[PDB]
């Protein structure tokens, strides 16, 4: 059978502003013979565990995966890593209804909006492992938190993008400080 999958992680983040650096690292067991890292939209690959990008470009954004080989056996491929280039478009607006300071137990709706031409939004809360996407396809979208708790408090930023290039996102909105008491 295949060897167990390696991990594939981006640091400092998978949401990389244009011209900022990022490392993609494939991590399998120590001492494996060969690594293969590949971008899902490329017809080529690299036979190294690390891809360092000194300055993020639109062409580098996309889905990536990696594998390793040990004693002739290839591993299962890693979970897909989505590398996003941010700062590609003007930032959207981000607001909270009824407001950013709210009591625990009720709802709070984080809302984003951009000009017509962008149909998707994603919310990123500082410190979270990943952004929150939204099934909405419209120039504005709502992200209701049905029951807010103190755990939902934090700094949120919203991004807008188009279904035509789902890995090219806008500059983040101004931050919203959600304070749940």
């Amino acid at each position, epitope marked *: 059978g295949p060897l167990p999958k390696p991990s594939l992680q981006a640091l400092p983040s998978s949401l990389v502003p244009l011209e900022k650096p990022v490392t993609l690292r494939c991590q399998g067991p120590p001492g494996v013979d060969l690594y293969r890292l590949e971008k899902l939209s490329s017809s080529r690959y690299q036979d190294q565990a690390v891809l360092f990008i000194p300055a993020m470009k639109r062409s580098l954004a996309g889905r990536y995966r990696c594998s390793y080989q040990n004693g002739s056996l290839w591993s299962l491929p890693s979970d897909q890593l989505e590398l996003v280039a941010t700062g590609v478009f003007a930032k959207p607006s981000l607001s909270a209804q009824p407001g950013p300071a709210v009591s625990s137990g009720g709802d709070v709706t*984080l809302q984003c909006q951009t000009r017509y031409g962008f149909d998707q939004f994603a919310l990123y809360k500082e410190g979270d*492992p990943a952004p929150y996407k939204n*099934p909405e396809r419209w120039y504005r979208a709502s992200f*209701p938190i049905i029951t807010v*708790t103190a755990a939902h408090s934090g700094t949120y930023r919203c991004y807008s993008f188009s279904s035509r290039d789902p890995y090219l996102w806008s500059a983040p909105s101004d931050p919203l400080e959600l304070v749940v008491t």
Partner: antibody
Amino acid sequence: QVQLVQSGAEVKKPGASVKVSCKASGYTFTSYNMHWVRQAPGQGLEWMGGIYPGNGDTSYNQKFQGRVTMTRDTSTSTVYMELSSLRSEDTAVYYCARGTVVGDWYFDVWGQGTLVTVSS
Amino acid sequence: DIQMTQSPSSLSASVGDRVTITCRSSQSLENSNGNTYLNWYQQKPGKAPKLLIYRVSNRFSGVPSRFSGSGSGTDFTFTISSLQPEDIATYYCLQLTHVPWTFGQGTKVEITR
């Protein structure tokens, strides 16, 4: 490949308990709350409660308060539901279903269900 | 608790017919912030339920356009504009506006042929 894989069917005596597992894969585990919904044979759906995997906070339907415990193991992306003092009325298929922490498009991915028969 | 009353409890319709299902809540589903969380699920036999509509009228990703939802307050509707043979299922409304979350008793949909 978003998936919720549950443990196999169970048979338990009245008065005993059952513990069902729900292993998640293909997504960021702490981005979705995990709820449990049950269905008695030939009947409708009933909401039991949910857990937030990030910190283990729970919120149960008062009808099960004191007899249901939901827990999670972050390292294996698994959520457990334990229901105690089982009676005939607890014979049901028990499903786990994910609910986005931010958003309201709840229960977009469900587990395959686990039949629990309560009988001596 | 909020009680969701679904009607009819079952129906049979021919391929291409318009099917309308109603769900009535015992009390208002407009919360203190003016919002309503009401979703519709489709459960085919031997399978888990599937999310079709969320937030009263939003089709979830990949859901065919024949499925729609509408309503406000205590009165909600789910519509199949042109019934297909593969649409045979029990459909359920769910209110996520007040805890405990409660489902309608379901509408079983069958085909007349």
